[PDB]
Amino acid sequence: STTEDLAKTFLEKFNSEAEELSHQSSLASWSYNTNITDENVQKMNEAGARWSAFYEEQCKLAKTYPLEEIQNLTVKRQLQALQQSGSSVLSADKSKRLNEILNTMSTIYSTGKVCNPSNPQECLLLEPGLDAIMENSKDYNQRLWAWEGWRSEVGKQLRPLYEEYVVLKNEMARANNYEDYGDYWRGDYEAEGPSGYDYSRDQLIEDVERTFAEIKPLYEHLHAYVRAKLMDTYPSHINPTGCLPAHLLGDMWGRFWTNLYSLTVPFGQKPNIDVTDAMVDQSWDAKRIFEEAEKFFVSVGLPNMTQGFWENSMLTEPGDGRKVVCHPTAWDLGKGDFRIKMCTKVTMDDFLTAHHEMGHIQYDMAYAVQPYLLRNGANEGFHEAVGEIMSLSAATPNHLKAIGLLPPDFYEDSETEINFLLKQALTIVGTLPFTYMLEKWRWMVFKGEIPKEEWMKKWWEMKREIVGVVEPVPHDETYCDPAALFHVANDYSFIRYYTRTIYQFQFQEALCQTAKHEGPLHKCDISNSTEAGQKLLQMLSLGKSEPWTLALERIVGVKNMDVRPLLNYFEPLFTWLKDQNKNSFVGWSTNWSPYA
Amino acid sequence: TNLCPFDEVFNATRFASVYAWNRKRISNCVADYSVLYNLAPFFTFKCYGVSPTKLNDLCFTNVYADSFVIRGDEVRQIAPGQTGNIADYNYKLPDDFTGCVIAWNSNKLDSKVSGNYNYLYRLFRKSNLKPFERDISTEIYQAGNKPCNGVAGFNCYFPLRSYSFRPTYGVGHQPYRVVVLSFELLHAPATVCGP
Ligand SMILES: *[C@@H]1O[C@H](CO)[C@@H](O)[C@H](O)[C@H]1NC(C)=O
Ligand SMILES: [Br-]
Ligand SMILES: [Br-]
Ligand SMILES: [Br-]
Ligand SMILES: [Br-]
Ligand SMILES: [Br-]
Ligand SMILES: [Br-]
Ligand SMILES: [Zn+2]
Numbered sequence: 001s002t003t004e005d006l007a008k009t010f011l012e013k014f015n016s017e018a019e020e021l022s023h024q025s026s027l028a029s030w031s032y033n034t035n036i037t038d039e040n041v042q043k044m045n046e047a048g049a050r051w052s053a054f055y056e057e058q059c060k061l062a063k064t065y066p067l068e069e070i071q072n073l074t075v076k077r078q079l080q081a082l083q084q085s086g087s088s089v090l091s092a093d094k095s096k097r098l099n100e101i102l103n104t105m106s107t108i109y110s111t112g113k114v115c116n117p118s119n120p121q122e123c124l125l126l127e128p129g130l131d132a133i134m135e136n137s138k139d140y141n142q143r144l145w146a147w148e149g150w151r152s153e154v155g156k157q158l159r160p161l162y163e164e165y166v167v168l169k170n171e172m173a174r175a176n177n178y179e180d181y182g183d184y185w186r187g188d189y190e191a192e193g194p195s196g197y198d199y200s201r202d203q204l205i206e207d208v209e210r211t212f213a214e215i216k217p218l219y220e221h222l223h224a225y226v227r228a229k230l231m232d233t234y235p236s237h238i239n240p241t242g243c244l245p246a247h248l249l250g251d252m253w254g255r256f257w258t259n260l261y262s263l264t265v266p267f268g269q270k271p272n273i274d275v276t277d278a279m280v281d282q283s284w285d286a287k288r289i290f291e292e293a294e295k296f297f298v299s300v301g302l303p304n305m306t307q308g309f310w311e312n313s314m315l316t317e318p319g320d321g322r323k324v325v326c327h328p329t330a331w332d333l334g335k336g337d338f339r340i341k342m343c344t345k346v347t348m349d350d351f352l353t354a355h356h357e358m359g360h361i362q363y364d365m366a367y368a369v370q371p372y373l374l375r376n377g378a379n380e381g382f383h384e385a386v387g388e389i390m391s392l393s394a395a396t397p398n399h400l401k402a403i404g405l406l407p408p409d410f411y412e413d414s415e416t417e418i419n420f421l422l423k424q425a426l427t428i429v430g431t432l433p434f435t436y437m438l439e440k441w442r443w444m445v446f447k448g449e450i451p452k453e454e455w456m457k458k459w460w461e462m463k464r465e466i467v468g469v470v471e472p473v474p475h476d477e478t479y480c481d482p483a484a485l486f487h488v489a490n491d492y493s494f495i496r497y498y499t500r501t502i503y504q505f506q507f508q509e510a511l512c513q514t515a516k517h518e519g520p521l522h523k524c525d526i527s528n529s530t531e532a533g534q535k536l537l538q539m540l541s542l543g544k545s546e547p548w549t550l551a552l553e554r555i556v557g558v559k560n561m562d563v564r565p566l567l568n569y570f571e572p573l574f575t576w577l578k579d580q581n582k583n584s585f586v587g588w589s590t591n592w593s594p595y596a
Numbered sequence: 597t598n599l600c601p602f603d604e605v606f607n608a609t610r611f612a613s614v615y616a617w618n619r620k621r622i623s624n625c626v627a628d629y630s631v632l633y634n635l636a637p638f639f640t641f642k643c644y645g646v647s648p649t650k651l652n653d654l655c656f657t658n659v660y661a662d663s664f665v666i667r668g669d670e671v672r673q674i675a676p677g678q679t680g681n682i683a684d685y686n687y688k689l690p691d692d693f694t695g696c697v698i699a700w701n702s703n704k705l706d707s708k709v710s711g712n713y714n715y716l717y718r719l720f721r722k723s724n725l726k727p728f729e730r731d732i733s734t735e736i737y738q739a740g741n742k743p744c745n746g747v748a749g750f751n752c753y754f755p756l757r758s759y760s761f762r763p764t765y766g767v768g769h770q771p772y773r774v775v776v777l778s779f780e781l782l783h784a785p786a787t788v789c790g791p
Contacts, residue, residue, distance in 0.1 A: 001741060006751055009739040012719065013753055020760045027764070064750075312764055336766010 004075055007065040011078055011371070014058055019334055019372045025051040026333035033341060034314050036323040058082060073194070074371070074545060081373040081544075084187075089175040090168075098168045101161050102491055109489045112154035117145060126150065126252070134252045135259045140234050147247035148473050151484045158483035163452055166445060169491075173446075182446035185493045188380050193547030197559060205443065208495065211502060211563045212436050218567060219433055221577040222425050223468050224586045226257065229264040241585040242592035243470035246463070250426075253485050254469055257430030261423050266576070267415040272423070273397065275405035276348045282404070286316045286344035289351050292403060293358045296394065300526060301533035302362050309338050309361070317343035328353050330360035330387075332375070338364055352391045359390035367543025376544040378551035380493075381500030386540070388504040389511070398525035421522060421573035428501060429570065435498040437466040441482060442494070453477055464590040472594045502561050503552070509565035510556040511536060521569045600625035600790065605661045606632065606698075611706075611773055613716040614686040615756060616732050617664040627659065627790025628652060636700030638668075638767065644676060645694035646779055654779075655786035662687070662776040665706060665715045667759065669768040671699045674776060685718040689776070690727035698775040703763055706771035712761035715771065719757040728778075 028047035032040040062082035070076045087095055114130055115123040124130050124146075133146045166181070173184040186201040223244070230248060231238045237245060250259030279289075294305050317326060326343035333339065340357045344350045363386050367375050377383040393399055400406040441459055444450045450458045456475050459482060463469045475481060482488045509521055515529035526532045539555040549559040556562075567574070600622050612618035629652045632641075641648065666674070666682055673683040676693045683689075689697075706712055720737040733755065738744040740751030761771045 006739055009720070009751070009753070016719070016757055023762075027762075306766055308764060308766060333764075335762070336769045337764050338766075 002069075003065050004070040004072060007062075007070060007079060008072075008075055010061065010065070011075060014062075015372055017054065018058070021051050021054050022372070023334045023337070026331065026337070030331065030333065030339065030341075033329070034318070034322065034324055036325070055082075056085070059085065074374075077545060078371055078373045084176075086176075087172050090172045094168060094171065098165075098172070101165050101168070105158055105161055105165070105483070105489045105491075108157050109154055109484075109486065112150070112157075114146060114149035114153050116149075130252060134247075135250060138233060138263075140237055140248070143247045144472055147252065150252060151475070151479060151481050155479050155481055155484040158489060159478060159480035162480050162483050165491075170446060180446040180448070182443040185495075188493065189499075189548070191547030191549055193550055197547045197550045197553075199547065199549050204495070207561050208436060208498060211561050212432070214563045214567070215429070215432055218425075218570060218574055218577075219429055220468075220586050220588075221574065221581055222429055223588065224581045224584050225577050226260060226264050226426075228581070228584045230260075233263055237594055239589075239592045241587075241589055243464050243468045243588045243590065245472045245594050246469050247472050249430075249469070253434070254467070255431055255434050255485070257426035258423070260426055264422065264426070266418045266422050266580075267413075270413055270416045270419055272419060273395075273400075273406075273412075273416065274348050275351070275400055276346070278405040279346050279348070279351065284346055286342075286346075286350075289344055289346075289354050290315055290340075290358065292351075293355045293394075296355060296390070296399075296527055297358065297362055297533075299528045300536070301530035302537070303365060305358070305361070306336065306338055306365075308336070309340070312337070313339040314341045315344050328357055330357040330364070332361075332364035334372070334375075336368070348395075352395055355390040355394040356387040359387035362386075363540050366537060366540035367545075369541060370543040370545050374543045374545040378539070378542065378544060378546070378548035379499070380496045381503050382539075382548065382551070384496075385500040385503035385507055386536075388500075389508045392504075392508055392522075393524065393526045396523055396525045398523065399527055402525075402527065417522075418573060418576050421570060421576075424522075425570055425573055428566075432498060432501060433467040435494060437462050438482065438485070438488070439493070439495045439498070440466070442488070456481065461590075464588075468588040470590075470593055474593075474595060499561065502563055502566060505565040505569050506552070506556045506558075506562055507536075509568060520572055521565070522572070598625040600627045600659075600788070602628070602631065602661075605663055606635070606775055608663070610714075611663050611665045611702075613714075613759075614664040614666050614682060614774075615716055615718040617662050617687050617730060619730075620661045620663070622659040622661060622788060623657075624787045625790075627788055629790065632698065634700070636702065638701045640671060640699035640772075641696065642675065643696035645692070646696070648696055651696075652790045655789040656779045657782050657784070657786055657788070658780040659788050660778040660780065662778070663774065665702065665759070665771050665773055666717070667768065668701070668766075668770050668772050671772050671774065674699070674774055681719060682717065684724045685721040685731070686725070687776075688725040688727050688729065693727070693778075694781075695776065695778045698777070699772050701767070701770060702773040703761075703765075703770045706773070707761040707763040707765065709763060712771075713758040715759040715761065716756050717759060718755055720753055720755045 025047045028044040032044040059082045062079050065079055067076060067079055070079065087098060090098065113123045113125060130146050130150055133142060137143050169181040173181040176184065178184040178187065183201055186204045189199060189204050190201045191197060191199040227238065227240065227244055230244065231240065234248060246254055250257050298304055314324070318324065329341045331339040331341065338361050340361060342350065342354065342357060344354065360383060363377065363383060397406060397410055397412050401408055401410055441450070441462055444458070445455065456477050456479050460471050460475070463471070487494050508524065511526045511532040512521060512524035514535050515524070515526050515532045517524040535555055539551050542551045542554065553559045601620070605620050629648070646654070664687065670680065670682040672678065673680045674687065674689065674697050676689050676691050678689070706715065718731065720739070721731065725731060735755065736744040736746060737753045737755045738751070739753060742749065742751070744752035759771070
């Protein structure tokens with residue numbers, strides 16, 4: 001008996017029904033995604049309905065095997081995965097209240113209109129109207145009414161729904177042994193693996209806070225340099241020693257500072273490296289782009305793309321009347337079926353994302369040797385980090401010279417390097433305080449440390465302090481500005497954008513050290529380093545069969561997050577920013593307001 | 597010049613399930629081993645104890661041809677000293693096996709868009725097969741200690757599973773047709789020569 005041995009037989013049977021049932025769901029999902037059709041929606045819905053049906057039956061079967069009786073960690077980790085359902089424990093009357101609220105929040109966000117006070121005929125959605133204003137407008141007042149209007153119209157409607165959402169989500173989490181819903185979300189990082197590879201859910205708060213304190217000095221200098229440049233655009237509204245107003249940061253929420261590049265570029269006389277003209281010059285097509293990506297992974301010792309990858313993928317928008325929504329995705333349908341769905345164009349962007357999506361594919365191929373339930377990234381942040389580091393090596397001048405998109409005589413200016421690092425910091429470094437503060441607010445709200453009379457009082461107190469961002473208009477407790485973001489309104493965890501940012505530079509630095517790359521980390525190119533590939537494969541092949549701490553240690557040597565690789569990546573920019581800010585206030589005072 | 601019926605074995609319309617593998621006795625004929633071009637892009641020809649080059653020069657008393665269909669990554673199990681579901685429970689070759697194993701991709705013939713569930717294999721068995729044993733039993737597999745009653749009951753399993761074969765599968769999951777040529781030599785007559 002030894003129920004493990006009984007559970008191995010159950011898992012032996014499960015791995016055949018599950019692996020191919022999940023395949024039918026992918027095929028039906030692929031049919032809709034590559035051919036949008038009323039009929040194809042039904043097949044995808046019904047195939048997924050079958051797959052979700054089976055899976056929840058098997059969970060019951062797997063729950064008749066005491067997890068405290070199994071010695072194989074692999075068998076344990078497989079049985080472990082079949083559990084952990086969610087809102088099923090919630091009562092029937094409370095269950096439909098929750099999914100009522102969720103669909104209400106999702107809809108009023110996606111359909112919410114905001115009307116310009118100067119023109120009542122001008123009422124714009126978020127996409128494409130309000131997004132266009134926040135990403136491109138340089139007028140202070142035009143940005144203000146879109147920012148306030150979005151948080152007033154859709155934000156206030158979400159406020160009472162979110163108060164009920166927090167209460168309901170907490171009760172389901174408490175009925176799952178979790179402290180709160182934030183504690184439930186941190187379960188995606190819990191590891192109970194061997195020896196000192198274990199990772200508690202409470203550790204995530206400490207390790208995120210510890211890492212962010214080491215990122216704060218770099219962010220402050222980026223914050224000060226951006227602030228000093230924004231003075232030349234909004235002189236009447238920018239305090240040189242105060243927080244940046246929220247509605248001037250390049251999007252609706254300040255999540256990314258990417259769109260401040262034009263106003264904040266170090267050397268505007270130097271254009272960014274763009275090999276798009278070269279790619280059209282050499283008459284590249286979509287097939288050539290992925291062939292070059294395949295060569296890049298072959299150069300580091302990784303396998304080629306499968307024959308079915310070329311035959312079955314969608315590497316180009318269909319010209320035969322099939323309607324698809326062009327969104328880059330890399331598919332792992334199972335049973336040896338790997339595909340990429342991209343409307344590839346001949347641009348440097350799609351050249352880079354092709355390496356990113358094929359980076360997803362290489363991860364999927366590597367852990368196919370694992371059982372079905374363990375075929376995933378080590379945690380939720382591993383996959384996107386793996387894809388991102390492929391774009392880093394691909395975009396380097398070192399790689400582009402070897403590929404033939406740059407002249408072998410190419411001269412890269414130090415000014416162009418700083419221009420590139422600054423643009424990276426706006427997206428990468430700018431989002432870190434935004435991501436950390438947002439999830440910290442939600443964590444404390446679920447933890448009950450922020451009373452509902454203080455939701456919008458804390459939110460801007462944390463936004464001023466942690467992010468250095470101040471609201472342009474005072475907001476009472478009728479607002480819900482966190483809910484005015486997609487991820488908060490659509491019941492999605494947000495700390496992944498913080499962890500995978502740290503993971504990717506930990507990955508890249510370790511791979512570049514293995515490749516013995518001399519020089520700044522941001523210039524490293526892991527191409528033609530088979531040694532880097534094996535160290536990468538040591539983690540890719542693991543999948544989710546080991547704790548993410550152990551999988552992290554296999555590639556980078558340490559079993560936890562570390563931001564020094566990130567700071568090492570931005571070190572040339574850090575010294576440049578410090579010189580530029582030696583006559584500017586570095587930091588911010590949380591007392592000043594634009595409405596003071 | 598009596599030609600041995602190799603067109604029956606290799607170019608058959610349908611092959612047998614590996615658990616119910618098919619053996620075709622061959623005797624008193626002329627064996628022309630040179631007709632096997634590739635009949636597949638991915639194709640395998642492994643011999644043990646005998647040399648396929650100059651194979652149509654020797655003589656044997658009887659030549660048994662075993663045929664079935666397995667997945668691409670189970671082809672390595674059709675070989676001496678191999679372990680795994682196909683070797684352990686479906687078709688086992690001896691350690692001192694003398695003969696050749698011929699495998700080739702059959703995705704065009706055996707894969708169907710709606711899935712081809714006709715090919716089966718044994719997933720559970722109390723013990724490994726002896727070499728060249730054939731088990732077509734359909735008795736319920738008792739994993740636990742409560743007797744399995746003939747059907748409904750916990751920790752019970754039907755011993756046979758279905759190979760689902762869809763054309764978009766990876767090569768390792770695609771159907772491969774296997775022909776195992778066992779060469780038998782009790783010297784004396786050696787009625788199968790094939791110059
Ligand atoms: C099977 O058919 C093909 C073409 O029809 C032929 O070339 C080949 O020799 C045949 N195989 C056998 C074993 O006769
Ligand atoms: Br609009
Ligand atoms: Br796309
Ligand atoms: Br917290
Ligand atoms: Br906000
Ligand atoms: Br380095
Ligand atoms: Br040939
Ligand atoms: Zn991606």
